[PDB]
Write a protein that binds this ligand. Structure first.
Ligand SMILES: *[C@@H]1O[C@H](CO)[C@@H](O[C@@H]2O[C@H](CO)[C@@H](O[C@@H]3O[C@H](CO[C@H]4O[C@H](CO)[C@@H](O)[C@H](O)[C@@H]4O)[C@@H](O)[C@H](O[C@H]4O[C@H](CO)[C@@H](O)[C@H](O)[C@@H]4O)[C@@H]3O)[C@H](O)[C@H]2NC(C)=O)[C@H](O)[C@H]1NC(C)=O
Ligand SMILES: *[C@@H]1O[C@H](CO)[C@@H](O[C@@H]2O[C@H](CO)[C@@H](O[C@@H]3O[C@H](CO[C@H]4O[C@H](CO)[C@@H](O)[C@H](O)[C@@H]4O)[C@@H](O)[C@H](O[C@H]4O[C@H](CO)[C@@H](O)[C@H](O)[C@@H]4O)[C@@H]3O)[C@H](O)[C@H]2NC(C)=O)[C@H](O)[C@H]1NC(C)=O
Ligand SMILES: *[C@@H]1O[C@H](CO)[C@@H](O[C@@H]2O[C@H](CO)[C@@H](O[C@@H]3O[C@H](CO)[C@@H](O)[C@H](O[C@H]4O[C@H](CO)[C@@H](O)[C@H](O)[C@@H]4O)[C@@H]3O)[C@H](O)[C@H]2NC(C)=O)[C@H](O)[C@H]1NC(C)=O
Ligand SMILES: *[C@@H]1O[C@H](CO)[C@@H](O[C@@H]2O[C@H](CO)[C@@H](O[C@@H]3O[C@H](CO)[C@@H](O)[C@H](O[C@H]4O[C@H](CO)[C@@H](O)[C@H](O)[C@@H]4O)[C@@H]3O)[C@H](O)[C@H]2NC(C)=O)[C@H](O)[C@H]1NC(C)=O
Ligand SMILES: O=C(O)CC[C@H](NC(=O)N[C@@H](CCCC(=O)NCc1ccc(F)cc1)C(=O)O)C(=O)O
Ligand SMILES: O=C(O)CC[C@H](NC(=O)N[C@@H](CCCC(=O)NCc1ccc(F)cc1)C(=O)O)C(=O)O
Ligand SMILES: *[C@@H]1O[C@H](CO)[C@@H](O[C@@H]2O[C@H](CO)[C@@H](O)[C@H](O)[C@H]2NC(C)=O)[C@H](O)[C@H]1NC(C)=O
Ligand SMILES: *[C@@H]1O[C@H](CO)[C@@H](O[C@@H]2O[C@H](CO)[C@@H](O)[C@H](O)[C@H]2NC(C)=O)[C@H](O)[C@H]1NC(C)=O
Ligand SMILES: *[C@@H]1O[C@H](CO)[C@@H](O[C@@H]2O[C@H](CO)[C@@H](O)[C@H](O)[C@H]2NC(C)=O)[C@H](O)[C@H]1NC(C)=O
Ligand SMILES: *[C@@H]1O[C@H](CO)[C@@H](O[C@@H]2O[C@H](CO)[C@@H](O)[C@H](O)[C@H]2NC(C)=O)[C@H](O)[C@H]1NC(C)=O
Ligand SMILES: *[C@@H]1O[C@H](CO)[C@@H](O[C@@H]2O[C@H](CO)[C@@H](O)[C@H](O)[C@H]2NC(C)=O)[C@H](O)[C@H]1NC(C)=O
Ligand SMILES: *[C@@H]1O[C@H](CO)[C@@H](O[C@@H]2O[C@H](CO)[C@@H](O)[C@H](O)[C@H]2NC(C)=O)[C@H](O)[C@H]1NC(C)=O
Ligand SMILES: *[C@@H]1O[C@H](CO)[C@@H](O)[C@H](O)[C@H]1NC(C)=O
Ligand SMILES: *[C@@H]1O[C@H](CO)[C@@H](O)[C@H](O)[C@H]1NC(C)=O
Ligand SMILES: *[C@@H]1O[C@H](CO)[C@@H](O)[C@H](O)[C@H]1NC(C)=O
Ligand SMILES: *[C@@H]1O[C@H](CO)[C@@H](O)[C@H](O)[C@H]1NC(C)=O
Ligand SMILES: [Ca+2]
Ligand SMILES: [Ca+2]
Ligand SMILES: [Cl-]
Ligand SMILES: [Cl-]
Ligand SMILES: [Zn+2]
Ligand SMILES: [Zn+2]
Ligand SMILES: [Zn+2]
Ligand SMILES: [Zn+2]
Lengths: 692, 692
């Protein structure tokens, strides 16, 4: 028959392997000819696989590239202005790729140009709390200094924002072996660790969901009216550049001034990790000089959009999307994901050629310019927002399929928890020691829920991937899944030249069994979402998490009992709303199970109630100063785009509140955010009441 | 049978008459006990009439009232500070009501307190062009002056905003007989004209759609967090008070300074209409002094919400709403409308008691605090916005049923033009000379379309009534209809104490036949919208008007050919989008007529495409500095809230552009607005394409 088992059985590890190899032989940098050619290949193949239509959707967006004839680098300069040490111009290419052209050298995308010269301050991970420690406790002033920060813990854009607000005149980012060199494993090509010449690329924007910096709100189409650079969204004001740990050792070894405040500031290099400012006595007249000459340029990008029309509800869309652009070869990021999408499309197309169609429409997307700020997905969603918010059932992301070989990692809306539990109980575990056991069993054993015995950990969605527009702007139920390691600082070869097909085939997944498991999870979710008669969402799971999040935010506020008394700060309305949501969801669930199953209008009313429940958490006014983060329950952390924050409006109103000069105003804003949250939870609850 | 004819035949003129009398014996001022009692009566009666549920929805909103022991008035003061002339403390009450208590004296709701003293400047209607003439041509400076303006032409809130920006320190509004005294008709009680002691009440806010000044975006519920007065939306900064023409004559007769610039500045009083500043020689040391002591106060209001659940699509709402609060007796405004709603509810309830239900759910609303800024409807819509934007089919307004006895007046979305033409062809004309002819025929004869022979005039929706939140904020197809006069300056007794039951019964509609015709139009529209299998919207009518509006806005821009050349200002994208909309709408219409009629999912997809088409013109970012005006095609005029403006974003970008100091910036913003409009029209068109 044509059921989920038939779909799942058609997926093959060997096909994923072939596609991965096919997608990783040359670089596919956004805006380059090679990535346009790959888009055309994928379009052709998806048509051959049997999709009903496959189109390219293009946009002209702001991208950033080094200058090929004026390379970026950092120096130590002596008192005469002689450059006595220079950082590398490129990563040593891996074996057999030493003649591959168009490898973009390491750079921080969207850095402005400049040649700032100054004294170094070491700022640990450049987190908000690292800057609090420097200014408030250590009394070190970063104003007019070049700061050097280790990658890790938080999104690099947040590091740069934090350095800017501290008054830094430039930022040097580096990979410390503490964070990117696993003990006991060899450097690439003999293992999966970062060599000392390896460097992590990546953008340093602070877009807060806007998409293309020049066209916030609207697609960057042929007639778009663009902001000037000075009014663009999210661009950094100071130069930034990334280096490897051989080069970092040379910049850090001479550092003087104050000692590190404790061991959480020390990485693994043989240097003191002194904070500065500047170098020790003998070298005190030497300085550090950056040379950044990259340019921002409006450049065409191409999304591939494939459609498999639904047989019964063609006006309901289930979306499987992931990006295609890579920094270099994209062996893990994104092609391990893209190869999985390709095999999922192939399997659905096999069923379609035998006469099957899903109940609802499935859309497949190969996004461009993700690496430059989620630009392809965001512009497309901006173009199609009306269609998406009235018809969008769900979005399943499909970036990297693997970041390790230990167990499953799932982040998603509470509406999908039951779907994920049920699906993983029907899938085979690929893990050694769990032969003949379910994926649910292996996952639950290796990654136990911190709340509930006998359940696996599922995390809330953060950001830094292409679901952002769909979930946090538009309120479409979203999820993601991949294979991960044991225990936000990525795998060692992340965004480096060393992330190749061979990395994956030799060290991560030689049999492609973890890739296949991830294909089954992502594809199985899509199948259920697109074919189940009743949408596979459980509103009661939202009720449970809303109480947890309400308890959490109340607990934060209750660190300030005197102020809560003075300003009459009550969470009673939020708990009331959460109680009401719990009650109404329970009653809706009863009707969903008991409704007349012959009546397709009651079913669709029910299905629309389910689809629009995630939508109900959207506030059209957005969060404060972040108009494109509209979901009231979930936003990316203001301190780390990768991490999700719950009740973000209240959280940010409470953050560091003891430091605000006007407590009356600050606690007034806490109360305002409690009102907005309680109202939104109640309003979402009421969408599940009987309709009339 | 149970069809529209049965519904229409049940409506009775004599019932409307009885309800009107019942609703107009005492004042029903928002926030007063008498208006709460009327709300409870209507709730009880709607339940008895047969609605499924009838609830009160209350909110606590900012209202404004005079101080009963510290009355508002204006003086002429001589050089010693003696008050030699005082304006009236109240309107002479009409016959038989001279002992009625709680008649609110004339005042401008939301005026701040103050006692400003100064020289008068007469500013005609206080329109934007009147202030342009004073400053730019006549070189008269209103800074620190008290301005005196005649009511008429534009919403009084716009007059006050314009006076404030001119630097006025107070505003006196008056009714000139040129605008409020029809030649040949007697003053009330012997005819329908305004007596010299009559005064027009009304609010002077500039809310731009916000609702309650203290809670923009969110309902003013029990736990709402309120702005402080200083941050409230829309409040005037200078005192304002309204007077009648006996009192105005006393203030105007001594005016000196400059002569009126032409005859369009002269009303009908026996005064010169000199502009000032100040009085002529003998009286030059005299001044005008206002005394305003009204207070703003958070006050409970009550909407009545009745539900008639749909038999087939109970999750689709057709709304019939109008306000209940009045300034005094509300003989026309609003009770002529409320009485019509009451009889419509009664007629639907009669059918329901015989076993009928409409296909879709009908909601009936008696709104409160309309007179204080559309507060009741707006707060309710804020509370229920998620339900409304996913389920709202249409909103039919029901304020005053009559403002004259000449012919029909209809303002509505283009989506309802065909519905209105078809319905009025099936209704009998009530007009003398058209016995046995259709309402369509009489209306078309008396109010010909300026574009098309053999069609009647239908206008675009402006604002100043309770449809605003539904149409311009939420994008729900809306309409209104009433009987009107031959040829924005209301009927003479508007918002005066003289607007009584007797006014209506003696002078406007003694047989209640015009009321009955309006009940048939409003009720018939609701019936069709709630019962037609395919929603009765024609998307092709939107295509026709979008071309008209595009031609209009292009024509405005083409008054500046040199600038369009310099800044490369093209409307090509907007015309392209309109062409595309026209083509796609034509194809959708073919499918709507040709689709398989047995398939309820294709029908609902079609019905959802129809319902969401008005929704597609909404921009979640709003218009510039007016976040609650979100419709890109239609907004209230920035110069006159009562008037609708098409392509408002482009219109306001072009307005007075020749006066802007930075033409590059100004024309850049024109181009931005063209892009937003072209994009929105294309996006709306694409919602009518095949869905997959
Ligand atoms: C969780 O869900 C529950 C419902 O089970 C909601 O309960 C409502 O809670 C509010 C309190 O926040 C109640 O509001 C009160 O309404 C009274 C009038 O209620 C009657 O009339 C209304 C219509 O006008 C009907 O809908 C209702 O059924 C009743 O018949 C007011 O008189 C109250 O105001 C008085 O007391 C307050 C507080 O002391 C004073 O501030 C006022 O000045 C005034 O003296 C009050 O407004 C409401 O009745 C409850 N509805 C119910 C039980 O159906 C919760 O609100 C909801 N949680 C959230 C966060 O929404
Ligand atoms: C009204 O509806 C029509 C459709 O009937 C829309 O037409 C589109 O118009 C735009 C122009 O604004 C066209 O854009 C052009 O696309 C070319 C590529 O098209 C092919 O590939 C795409 C996918 O990538 C397919 O969708 C398409 O079917 C074609 O196969 C580009 O090469 C063009 O760019 C080049 O020329 C321009 C202008 O000189 C330069 O600025 C560029 O730098 C570049 O050299 C251009 O982008 C689009 O193809 C049309 N689609 C069609 C016919 O299907 C109208 O846009 C629409 N009106 C509005 C307001 O939306
Ligand atoms: C994940 O899997 C779980 C476990 O299967 C699943 O929960 C189960 O869902 C079914 C179907 O809704 C539940 O069965 C219902 O239970 C009630 C009470 O026993 C019955 O009244 C229902 O009967 C009606 O519907 C039947 C068809 O479903 C008709 O045959 C019948 O005539 C009635 O109309 C029905 O049997 C079952 O109770 C739960 N089990 C739980 C919660 O433990 C869950 O839904 C899955 N999650 C997702 C997202 O799919
Ligand atoms: C206002 O009134 C006008 C005038 O009645 C009305 O326009 C008419 O609508 C009908 C119904 O859509 C149109 O009739 C259709 O015309 C085409 C071509 O002739 C036919 O193919 C259609 O046949 C299909 O549908 C029928 C049922 O409607 C089935 O019986 C049949 O098997 C087919 O499936 C159908 O007859 C008619 O052409 C227009 N007339 C015009 C435009 O002059 C208009 O819709 C009304 N407006 C509103 C808002 O209700
Ligand atoms: O501009 C942006 O917003 C991000 C662009 C780019 N995005 C990424 O590289 N994202 C990777 C980096 C991983 C970061 C992370 O903290 N992931 C957490 C996570 C949790 C559960 C999963 F299933 C998958 C990932 C990713 O999402 O795979 C970047 O950070 O440079
Ligand atoms: O605060 C506000 O936005 C308005 C409150 C109040 N609103 C009204 O009194 N509105 C009346 C005044 C009539 C103004 C007008 O220009 N009406 C035009 C019009 C056109 C077609 C119709 F079917 C009905 C009215 C009404 O809409 O009936 C007011 O102006 O003081
Ligand atoms: C990746 O696979 C594609 C598809 O098999 C290859 O592209 C095809 O190459 C052959 C031989 O040059 C052509 O005849 C076909 O027209 C191509 N088909 C397409 C683009 O759909 C491509 O060569 C492979 N790339 C690598 C690096 O192996
Ligand atoms: C990239 O760097 C090159 C080399 O410095 C820039 O090309 C030079 O530009 C200047 C004027 O801007 C000319 O006078 C030189 O003759 C050019 N040099 C060479 C070797 O061609 C180029 O402008 C930069 N590219 C950018 C900014 O995109
Ligand atoms: C670091 O790189 C710089 C730039 O290439 C080198 O400095 C240049 O050296 C050449 C030849 O000696 C001079 O003609 C240039 O004027 C220098 N340019 C600048 C900007 O200083 C420098 O020698 C390199 N340092 C090391 C240690 O390799
Ligand atoms: C308006 O009509 C209502 C309804 O007929 C009248 O209210 C009723 O009055 C009688 C006699 O006092 C009471 O017994 C009923 O309980 C009332 N019914 C309600 C409120 O539903 C009211 O008297 C009329 N008002 C005027 C001014 O005539
Ligand atoms: C309305 O006006 C009255 C009368 O002027 C105000 O009442 C007076 O208030 C002052 C102090 O604010 C007292 O000292 C007087 O004795 C009061 N006079 C009387 C006659 O009671 C009243 O405050 C005003 N109401 C408002 C602002 O709502
Ligand atoms: C206009 O009204 C004011 C206020 O009532 C009158 O002025 C008051 O007159 C009484 C009695 O003569 C004095 O005790 C008060 O001091 C006056 N108050 C003020 C504020 O001036 C005035 O007489 C009235 N003018 C006319 C022409 O009737
Ligand atoms: C940091 O240094 C600059 C002066 O170079 C100064 O403007 C700023 O206020 C300093 N902050 C301190 C010392 O806290
Ligand atoms: C694969 O799993 C083995 C066994 O647990 C482990 O030793 C190895 O480090 C893993 N490889 C990667 C790349 O994580
Ligand atoms: C209007 O009058 C005031 C001075 O009383 C002044 O501030 C303002 O600039 C004047 N404008 C003119 C004369 O245009
Ligand atoms: C009613 O109609 C008659 C006849 O046209 C007209 O003379 C009279 O002024 C109308 N009454 C009102 C209040 O408009
Ligand atoms: Ca954009
Ligand atoms: Ca509000
Ligand atoms: Cl992912
Ligand atoms: Cl109306
Ligand atoms: Zn990626
Ligand atoms: Zn990446
Ligand atoms: Zn009214
Ligand atoms: Zn009114």
């Amino acid at each position: 028959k044509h059921n989920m088992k038939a779909f799942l059985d058609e997926l093959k590890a060997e096909n994923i392997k072939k596609f991965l190899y096919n997608f990783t032989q040359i670089p596919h940098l956004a805006g380059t000819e090679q990535n346009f050619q790959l888009a055309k290949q994928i379009q052709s193949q998806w048509k051959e696989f049997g999709l009903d239509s496959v189109e390219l959707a293009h946009y002209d967006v702001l991208l950033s590239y080094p200058n090929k004839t004026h390379p970026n680098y950092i120096s130590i300069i002596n008192e005469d202005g002689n450059e006595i040490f220079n950082t590398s111009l490129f990563e040593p290419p891996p074996p057999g790729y030493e003649n591959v052209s168009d490898i973009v050298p390491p750079f921080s995308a969207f850095s402005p140009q400049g040649m700032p010269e100054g004294d170094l301050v070491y700022v640990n991970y450049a987190r908000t709390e690292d800057f609090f420690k420097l200014e408030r406790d250590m009394k070190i002033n970063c104003s007019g200094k070049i700061v050097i920060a280790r990658y890790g813990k938080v999104f690099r854009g947040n590091k740069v924002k934090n350095a800017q607000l501290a008054g830094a005149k430039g930022v040097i980012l580096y990979s410390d072996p503490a964070d990117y060199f696993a003990p006991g494993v060899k450097s690439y090509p003999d293992g999966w660790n970062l060599p000392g010449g390896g460097v992590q690329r990546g953008n340093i924007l602070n877009l807060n969901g806007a998409g293309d910096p020049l066209t916030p709100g609207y697609p960057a189409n042929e007639y778009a009216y663009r902001r000037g650079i000075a009014e663009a969204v999210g661009l950094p004001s100071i130069p930034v550049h990334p280096i490897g740990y051989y080069d970092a050792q040379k910049l850090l070894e001479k550092m003087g001034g104050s000692a590190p405040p404790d061991s959480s500031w020390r990485g693994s290099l043989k240097v003191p990790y002194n904070v500065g400012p500047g170098f020790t006595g003998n070298f005190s007249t030497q300085k550090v000089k950056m040379h950044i000459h990259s340019t921002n340029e409006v450049t065409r990008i191409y999304n591939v959009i494939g459609t498999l029309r639904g047989a019964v509800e063609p006006d309901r869309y289930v979306i499987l999307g992931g990006h295609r652009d890579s920094w270099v070869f994209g062996g893990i990021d994104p092609q391990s994901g893209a190869a999985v999408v390709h095999e999922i499309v192939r399997s659905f197309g096999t069923l379609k050629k035998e006469g099957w169609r899903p109940r609802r429409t499935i859309l497949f997307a190969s996004w461009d310019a993700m690496e430059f700020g989620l630009l392809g997905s965001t512009e497309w969603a901006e173009e199609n927002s009306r269609l998406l918010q009235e018809r969008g059932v769900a979005y399943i992301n499909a970036d990297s399929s693997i970041e390790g070989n230990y167990t499953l990692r799932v982040d998603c809306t509470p509406l999908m928890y039951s779907l994920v539990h049920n699906l993983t109980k029907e899938l085979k575990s690929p893990d050694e020691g769990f032969e003949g056991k379910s994926l649910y069993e292996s996952w639950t054993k290796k990654s136990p829920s911190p709340e509930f015995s006998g359940m696996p950990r599922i995390s809330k969605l953060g950001s830094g991937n292409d679901f952002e527009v769909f979930f946090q702007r538009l309120g479409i139920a979203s999820g993601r899944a991949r294979y991960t390691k044991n225990w936000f600082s990525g795998y060692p070869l992340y965004h480096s030249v060393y992330e190749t097909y061979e990395l994956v085939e030799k060290f991560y997944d030689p049999m492609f069994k973890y890739h296949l498991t991830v294909a089954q999870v992502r594809g199985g979710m899509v199948f259920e979402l697109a074919n189940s008669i009743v949408l596979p969402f459980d509103c009661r799971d939202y009720a449970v998490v809303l109480r947890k999040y309400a308890d959490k935010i109340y607990s934060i506020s209750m660190k300030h009992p005197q102020e809560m008394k003075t300003y009459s700060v009550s969470f009673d309305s939020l708990f009331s709303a959460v109680k009401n949501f719990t009650e109404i969801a329970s009653k809706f669930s009863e009707r969903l199970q008991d409704f007349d199953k012959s009546n397709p209008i009651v079913l669709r009313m029910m299905n629309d109630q389910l689809m629009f429940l995630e939508r109900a958490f959207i506030d059209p006014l957005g969060l404060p100063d972040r108009p494109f983060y509209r979901h009231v329950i979930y936003a990316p952390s203001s301190h780390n785009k990768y991490a999700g924050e719950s009740f973000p409006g209240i959280y940010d109103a409470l953050f560091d509140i003891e430091s605000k000069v006007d407590p009356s105003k600050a606690w007034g804003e806490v109360k305002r955010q409690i009102y907005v949250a309680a109202f939104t939870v109640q309003a979402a609850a009421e969408t599940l009441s009987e309709v009339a």
